[PDB]
Design a protein around this ligand. Structure first.
Ligand SMILES: *[C@@H]1O[C@H](CO)[C@@H](O)[C@H](O)[C@H]1NC(C)=O
Lengths: 45, 48
């Protein structure tokens, strides 16, 4: 139990570290929404 | 000038409709109006 809990606590620390660097799947939805609206307004010219 | 009302305007040949209010931003001395990333006009300089 001690070893298992230590491995778990250590692994959560590596997630927290890695996320302080991966979100491309969320970011590119935000980008595509904005890029489509900017295209729609530019197209009025 | 008529600030803070929806007005129809003509600044020195640049025309539109909108509400005019004093800006925090400042242009270079030769620049006459501002545009945003979409190329809509977001600010203007009063010629008087
Ligand atoms: C325009 O004329 C007014 C009235 O004399 C004066 O207060 C103002 O400073 C002048 N502005 C320019 C840009 O000449």
């Amino acid at each position: 139990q001690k070893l298992i809990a230590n491995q778990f606590n250590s692994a959560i620390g590596k997630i927290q570290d890695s996320l302080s660097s991966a979100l491309g799947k969320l970011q590119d939805v935000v980008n595509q929404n904005a890029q489509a609206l900017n295209t729609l307004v530019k197209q009025l010219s | 000038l008529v600030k803070n009302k929806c007005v129809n305007f003509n600044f020195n040949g640049l025309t539109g409709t909108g509400v005019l209010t004093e800006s925090n931003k400042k242009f270079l001395p030769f620049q006459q109006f501002g545009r945003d990333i979409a190329d809509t006009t977001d600010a203007v300089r009063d010629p008087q």
